[PDB]
Design a binder for this molecule. Structure first.
Ligand SMILES: [Ca+2]
Ligand SMILES: [Ca+2]
Ligand SMILES: [Ca+2]
Ligand SMILES: [Ca+2]
Ligand SMILES: [Ca+2]
Ligand SMILES: [Ca+2]
Lengths: 68, 143, 67, 143
């Protein structure tokens, strides 16, 4: 659930691309219904570059799960 | 105590009908460095036309780590991430981004075109802890 | 400069991400100064999924240059 | 009958105030397969409310390879790429996407809500050679 910003059941490169595009203003929101639940990977109730970094660590295999 | 970490936008002189670069700087970077950033820059689109934005000299692996986009006329989104999340935090004070603008010929001498941070900018250090920036806003002074 | 849709001098995952976003109907204007020159990798003067696929091949190392 | 390579949208029956699925199909795919696609689907947004779109059963590794987005009410953008550009071309005829709509209660029985391809759809085969589709549009027949 967290990390799956397109709500398609997988967390992958496309969720990273969506997050990057969101932070650059190329998306108004995310396809997932619950944007904060999908995009907030550190629990601060904001979606920002810290969340982007956390997603990167996950896709690099540097972490295994999000600390919700 | 007030932080020494600063995000600042220069104040520069510009001539209507010409172009100008507006540097955006970081200074007082703490020992943990900067691993993430995202913030909005607003500019006076009645006077300035955004051309492009370039990563500044302090930015690590800028081709990958840095992005900037015009969301709408007058509003830029800026993004930095150390894509390694290991070896590529920013540690050096200096220019973070250079913003390139054309200045409309209609713009009047003696007036200013504001270039500012909109909202509270987000920075993360190498531990992915938020760090607060002291912001100084800038402008193109038209002459 | 073909492939460099954000106009930053490098061709990488971020150019791929922008093109995905374009093809899904979001960003209308790439940051590059010349969208067709940056985005058209097969010479049809259009940016579409063929260009997206070519860029993927380049980023996978399956091709080394564009046509 | 339909021969050759076809992109077709089904004609389906639907009840105002209920939901409906509209399949989008490929048929006559050659041995060279389909490695990429992008196209626009327009629908009558005065009668149908788009909920979501699901990859059809012919789509290979859909969690990575497939995307669909509502650009505006009445306009969907569909995207497929074999991200491996090797082992994931589509070779099998059948359902490419399932489009899920709520049918407005105001939609009149005996009328139809068109669902159509807008423009010429783009397909590439396993060597990224362009492949031209014969297009057949569809509809929700309201009853
Ligand atoms: Ca996902
Ligand atoms: Ca949402
Ligand atoms: Ca967060
Ligand atoms: Ca680039
Ligand atoms: Ca452009
Ligand atoms: Ca092309």
């Amino acid at each position: 659930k967290p990390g799956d910003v397109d709500g398609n059941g997988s967390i992958n490169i496309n969720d990273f691309a969506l997050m990057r595009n969101y932070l650059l203003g190329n998306l108004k929101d995310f396809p997932a219904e619950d944007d904060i639940k999908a995009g907030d990977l550190n629990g601060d109730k904001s979606i920002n570059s810290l969340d982007f970094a956390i997603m990167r660590m996950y896709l690099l295999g540097m972490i295994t799960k999000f600390s919700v | 105590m007030q932080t020494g970490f600063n995000l600042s936008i220069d104040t520069v002189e510009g001539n209507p009908g010409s172009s100008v670069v507006v540097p955006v700087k970081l200074s007082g970077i703490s020992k943990n460095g900067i691993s993430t950033a995202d913030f909005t820059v607003t500019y006076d689109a009645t006077k300035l036309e955004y051309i492009s934005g370039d990563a500044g000299s302090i930015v690590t692996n800028p081709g990958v780590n840095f992005g900037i986009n015009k969301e709408s006329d007058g509003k830029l989104k800026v993004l930095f991430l150390d894509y390694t999340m290991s070896t590529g935090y920013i540690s050096t004070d200096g220019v973070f981004a250079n913003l390139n603008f054309n200045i409309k010929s209609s713009a009047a001498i003696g007036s200013k075109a504001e270039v500012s941070i909109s909202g509270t900018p987000t920075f993360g250090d190498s531990t992915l802890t938020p760090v607060v920036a002291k912001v100084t806003n800038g402008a193109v002074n038209l002459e």
